[PDB]
Design a binder for this molecule. Structure first.
Ligand SMILES: Cc1cc2nc3c(=O)[nH]c(=O)nc-3n(C[C@H](O)[C@H](O)[C@H](O)COP(=O)(O)O)c2cc1C
Ligand code: SF4
Ligand code: FES
Lengths: 213, 430, 85
């Protein structure tokens, strides 16, 4: 929750970080996406790649990203503290992100937050003592008609009730992986009482095309 | 046409909106995408920009600027620097979840829109700035872009027209301010997503200091359909200067929260009672509706009875159309708590660059948090009005406007609820 | 820059010393706090020459006009890009 750093014995500039060689080839592919002379444009994807490899960002992933892109380390520290996905503390293995903005709050995301809390025994911001779950409270995740919903490390679990999210936490404690979708009957975003549109077969190529084209 | 709405499936641009068909290339070609694309690319920039100007397309990002007039700012001879189309796929707006549906379910339509819009402005490549939380959607679009490269549709000699056009995907990292066009440009360049001042406009100095148009997913994805079906077809829908179809996100306190495509100047009551299954508890249970995502001021049930869901009817209704993300609120809602949670969003999503939003959106969160409990006096309502008017029109970008406008809508339509909240606080805590 | 609008006339600083009793700054200089304000240079030169004072004149140092551009912060190929904002 702090935006200054202090060198702890588990987070210091001599904490061992290095990319795997297949991640060096991934960083080559990332840096080739941007124009020559603008290698600093790959600060966000390579830092996300370092977080995906390591689970979180020590201050050696930031220094390695500054070392392999030839940018100042302060200009990587700015990006790492600005964006709210870069975990500068070690988070749990399943990082649960409950949305509590107004379209999810109106559809009772507080009951889901309370269900996750009394299932895990933690509160907002805490990590479980076995380092499996970190429950934080996030802003709008962009799945608003599927409210209420959480995100667990990559995956959107949508249309949730307390029973649905407790079943998800059960099968995440069981070592399995759940299916990322709406936990009600519907599939992605349609009206739940059947399709109110797009029931007819779509037309295909050549339909309605103007002349001379 | 005097009555709008009731849009048929032959006029829906976003077929396979619901994921009910194959999103891949063998599905997208069988629904109409990537048809006669070489003939669109070989008719030049000026024909395509004329078909976008004639169609009356306005920007679907929330500003509503005329899209053909916007894209013709790039229609100028090169000066050595490359040109870049940039697709705004951030979509951090509360209520808004439609570009997720376009990218997740119609990705080749976004790729063909990138190709057509980049040929129209003479762009070298396309950087799609997708939301970093949309990881499955990003890999979905990446499989589609690999399918469009391996079919020769983009890349070297795109669609066999003698045009070289790359399409990139840049994943964000969790900031709502990176949906603003200059801050998105700053985030592609590898910095903090902090907006630029204008001038320079991005068509002069944009991403990497090149000429650049930033455009929404939806206004890019409808452009091949506007080219194929014609501009007059797309301009036959909605009112004049409000032309076309539109994805509407109805959420909140409705029975069936949904993404739906609908004609532009549809009534809001018809949209809710037709595609969403009504307000939870009937239309008489309606308290307020935020019409277009969080940056637009709310309008109460008396305004929502006859309002039309395009730009001009909502600007005359002292609100905005925005991303057209309909948040529906019933009479069982603490509306001051909802607008306070929305202002809490706007201070946790604000890049902190200039003084009015950085200081005043936090100070509006503190005043709204006292208004929820009632720990205030009625002079502070007009005080909060003047604070919101000091933020509005004084910031670098429009997150100050988009954080001042909900406070203004709440005060303007619900001053009596604030006053009775505070006076019952006074008569039970003193 | 409101304090850089007018011409001044001060004198050479003379001895200040520690008061033995209190450590205060004593002086024997009567013209030590005398500061006169003039609108132009020629008026100050005329007031110095009129009273028999020997003077030196330092010319007004105006800041030179700078070429400012917000878009130079984001150039394509020039070094004047900003690394942050
Ligand atoms: C705070 C803020 C957030 C924005 N977020 C988005 C967004 O998520 N998606 C989007 O398309 N436009 C967003 N915009 C609007 C853009 O600045 C810009 O108008 C748009 O992306 C491109 O123009 P267009 O509407 O013609 O497509 C946002 C604007 C502001 C001020
Ligand atoms: S309005 Fe707010 S979010 Fe935008 S540049 Fe200013 S402080 Fe940043
Ligand atoms: S409000 Fe929770 S996802 Fe948009």
């Amino acid at each position: 929750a702090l935006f200054v750093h202090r060198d702890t014995p588990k987070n210091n500039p001599e904490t061992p970080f290095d990319f795997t060689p297949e991640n060096y080839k991934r960083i080559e592919a990332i840096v080739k996406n941007y124009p020559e002379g603008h290698k600093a444009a790959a600060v966000l994807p390579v830092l996300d790649l370092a977080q995906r490899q390591n689970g979180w960002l020590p201050i050696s992933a930031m220094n390695k990203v500054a070392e392999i892109l030839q940018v100042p380390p302060m200009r990587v520290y700015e990006v790492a503290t600005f964006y709210t996905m870069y975990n500068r503390k070690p988070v749990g293995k399943y990082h649960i992100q409950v949305c509590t903005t107004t379209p999810c709050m109106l559809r009772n995301s507080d009951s889901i937050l309370e269900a996750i809390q009394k299932k895990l025994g933690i509160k907002v911001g805490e990590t479980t003592p076995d380092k499996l779950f970190t429950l934080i409270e996030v802003e709008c995740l962009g799945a608003c008609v599927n409210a209420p919903m959480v995100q667990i490390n990559d995956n959107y679990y949508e249309d949730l009730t307390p029973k649905d999210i407790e079943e998800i936490i059960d099968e995440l404690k069981a070592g399995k992986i759940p299916k990322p979708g709406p936990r009600s009957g519907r599939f992605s975003c349609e009206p739940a009482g059947g399709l109110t549109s797009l029931t007819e077969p779509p037309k295909g190529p050549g339909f309605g095309v103007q002349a001379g084209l | 046409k005097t009555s709008f709405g009731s849009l048929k499936d032959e006029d829906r641009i976003f077929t396979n909106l619901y994921g009910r068909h194959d999103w891949r290339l063998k599905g997208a070609q069988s629904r109409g995408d990537w048809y006669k694309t070489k003939e669109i690319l070989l008719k030049g920039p000026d024909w395509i920009l004329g078909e976008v100007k004639t169609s009356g397309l306005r920007g679907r990002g929330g500003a509503g600027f005329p899209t053909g007039l916007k894209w013709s700012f790039m229609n100028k001879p090169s000066d050595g620097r490359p040109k870049y189309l940039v697709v705004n796929a951030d979509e951090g707006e509360p209520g808004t979840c439609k570009d997720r549906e376009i990218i997740r379910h119609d990705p080749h339509k976004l790729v063909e829109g990138c190709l057509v819009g980049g040929r129209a402005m003479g762009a070298r490549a396309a950087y799609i700035y997708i939301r970093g939380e949309f990881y499955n959607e990003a890999s979905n679009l990446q499989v589609a872009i690999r399918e469009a490269y391996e079919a020769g549709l983009i890349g070297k000699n795109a669609c066999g027209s003698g045009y070289d056009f790359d399409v990139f995907v840049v994943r964000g990292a969790g900031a709502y301010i990176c949906g603003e066009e200059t801050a998105l440009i700053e985030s592609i360049e590898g910095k903090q997503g902090k907006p630029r001042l204008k001038p320079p406009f991005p068509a002069d100095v944009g991403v990497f200091g090149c000429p650049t148009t930033v455009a929404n997913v939806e206004t890019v994805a409808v452009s091949p359909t506007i080219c194929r079906r014609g501009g007059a077809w797309f301009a036959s829908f909605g009112r004049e200067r409000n032309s076309g179809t539109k994805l509407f996100n109805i959420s909140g306190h409705v029975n069936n929260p949904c993404t739906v495509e609908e004609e532009m100047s549809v009534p809001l009551k018809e949209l809710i009672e037709k595609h969403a299954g009504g307000v939870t508890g009937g239309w008489d249970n309606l308290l307020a509706v935020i019409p277009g995502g969080s940056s637009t001021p709310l309008i109460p049930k008396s305004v929502c009875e006859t309002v039309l869901m395009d730009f001009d009817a909502l600007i005359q209704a002292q609100t905005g159309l925005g991303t057209a993300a309909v948040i529906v609120m019933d009479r069982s809602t603490d509306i001051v708590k909802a607008i306070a949670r929305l202002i809490e969003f706007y201070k946790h999503e604000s890049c902190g660059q200039c003084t009015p939003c950085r200081e005043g959106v936090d100070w509006m969160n503190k005043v709204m948090a006292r208004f929820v409990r009632g720990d205030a006096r009625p002079a502070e309502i007009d005080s909060l009005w003047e604070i919101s008017k000091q933020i509005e029109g004084h910031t670098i970008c429009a997150l100050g406007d988009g954080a001042a406008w909900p406070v203004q809508g709440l005060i303007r339509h619900f001053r009596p609820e604030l006053e009775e909240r505070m006076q019952r606080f006074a008569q039970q805590h003193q | 820059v409101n304090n850089t609008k007018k011409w001044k006339m001060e004198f050479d600083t003379r001895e200040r010393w520690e008061n033995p009793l209190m450590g205060w700054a004593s002086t024997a200089d009567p013209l030590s706090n005398l500061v006169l304000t003039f609108s132009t240079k020629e008026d100050a030169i005329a007031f110095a020459e009129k009273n028999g004072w020997s003077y030196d004149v330092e010319e007004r140092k105006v800041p030179k006009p700078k070429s400012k551009s917000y878009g130079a912060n984001f150039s394509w190929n020039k070094r004047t890009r900003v690394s942050t904002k």
